[PDB]
C-alpha cells in the first residue's frame, strides 16, 4: 500500500470529436484463489487515517475520475470491491456510505474531500438514508 | 478451485 499511495496521489492531483468506441476481449476472469471482498470498517478507518496522516486527500477537489483512481488502486492492491466509496446524495455535505470511511465531501456543487473522525462513530449516512442499509 | 468469500456487507 504504503509505497503505492504517493504514486497514486499524484495521479489524482493530475486529473482535473467522438468517443473512441471501445473493444472487448469478452468476459470477466477470476484469478483462481485470490479473495475479493467489500471494504471493512477497520480497513476503512485505517486507510482514512493513513491518508489523513500522509496527506494528499484533504481539501482535494472531488471528481469521479479522481475517486476512481483511488478505488481501483485499493481494488488492485487490496482486493476490495470498488463499490465502497459512495457518498450520500447532495446537495450539501456528502456523507460516506461505508461506516469507517472518515472522509466526506463538503461544498467549496464543487465539493472536496474532508476528513472527519466523527464518521468512524456516527454513521451519518445511515441516519440520513436508512434504506440504503 | 474456489475463492473464499466475505461473510458480510462490511461496506454497507
Amino acid at each position: 500500500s504504503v509505497i503505492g499511495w504517493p504514486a497514486v496521489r499524484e495521479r489524482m492531483r493530475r486529473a482535473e470529436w467522438l468517443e473512441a468506441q471501445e473493444e472487448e476481449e469478452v468476459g470477466f476472469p477470476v484469478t483462481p484463489q485470490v479473495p475479493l471482498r467489500p471494504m471493512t470498517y477497520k480497513a476503512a478507518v485505517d486507510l482514512s487515517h493513513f491518508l489523513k496522516e500522509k496527506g494528499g486527500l484533504e481539501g482535494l477537489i472531488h471528481s469521479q475520475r479522481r475517486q476512481d483512481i483511488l478505488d481501483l488502486w485499493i481494488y488492485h492492491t487490496q482486493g476490495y470491491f470498488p463499490d465502497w466509496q459512495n457518498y450520500t446524495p447532495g446537495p450539501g455535505v456528502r456523507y460516506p456510505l461505508t461506516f469507517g470511511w472518515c472522509y466526506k465531501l463538503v461544498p467549496v456543487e464543487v465539493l472536496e474531500w474532508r476528513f472527519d473522525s466523527r464518521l468512524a462513530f456516527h454513521h451519518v449516512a445511515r441516519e440520513l438514508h436508512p434504506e440504503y442499509f | 478451485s474456489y475463492s473464499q468469500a466475505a461473510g458480510s456487507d462490511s461496506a454497507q
Binding site: 477470476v30 463499490d83 | 474456489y2 461496506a11
Partner: protein
Amino acid sequence: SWRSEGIKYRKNEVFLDVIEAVNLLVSANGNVLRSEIVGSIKMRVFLSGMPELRLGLNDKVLFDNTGRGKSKSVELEDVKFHQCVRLSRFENDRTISFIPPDGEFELMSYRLNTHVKPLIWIESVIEKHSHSRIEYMVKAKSQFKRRSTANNVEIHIPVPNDADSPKFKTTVGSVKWVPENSEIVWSVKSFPGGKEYLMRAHFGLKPPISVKFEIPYFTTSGIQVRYLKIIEKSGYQALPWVRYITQNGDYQLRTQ
C-alpha cells in the same frame, strides 16, 4: 435435504458455483441474431444447525436503491429462486435471505439478454479440393481474455450426408468424422483466449455449426458474489467459497 435441527459438521462451510450458459445464434452473414446468458447459482451447503444466510451480489437494482448506482453492477432478469428464499425480502429491498437446505441445490437462476462478442468464433469456408472431392477450411478463434482458457471445446461442423473418405489436417486438437450425425467434430482439450486455430478437412463425393465449451474462472455477465453472510445462534465459524464457470448451453453459428 430439508434441514431438520441438529445437522452437524466438523467444519461449517458453503460452496457456491456461479454457472453461466451462453446462448448464441449467428447468421451465415455473421449477424448475431441472438445472444443471451442464462446463469445459475448452485450451492453445496455444509452447515451445522440452523443458519440464516444472506447473499450479497453486485445486483444493479440493489445498488441503484442503496446509493451505489455509480458502481458497476449487473442487471439481472427473470430471476428465480429456490423455495428457501424469502421473496418478500427480495421484493422489498432486494435482500436474498434464506435458511438453506442441507447439501446441494440451486439457489437462483437468471438471465441477461446482453450482446457481447461471441466467445468463440467459427469461420468455415468450402472449396473444391479435387475432382468430386470437397474441402472445408475452418478457422476457430477465441475472443475471450488471453489469461483465460476454454476446456473441452468441441466444434460440430455439419458435412453432407453423402460425403466419404474424409481426410483431416489440423494445427491443434483433433478431428473425427461422425457419419451417423453426418458431421465432423473438432475437439480441443484446451483453448486459450486470444487464439486462432485452423483445421482443414476434405472428403470424397444445412444445420448450423455448434460448439461446446467450458471456461472456468470466468464469467460473461460480470456477476460477483460480494459476500455470503451466515448467522447461526451458536455463533460459529462458517466459511463461504465461490467459483465462476462459464459454458456453452446453446451456441450456434449458421453456415447459410
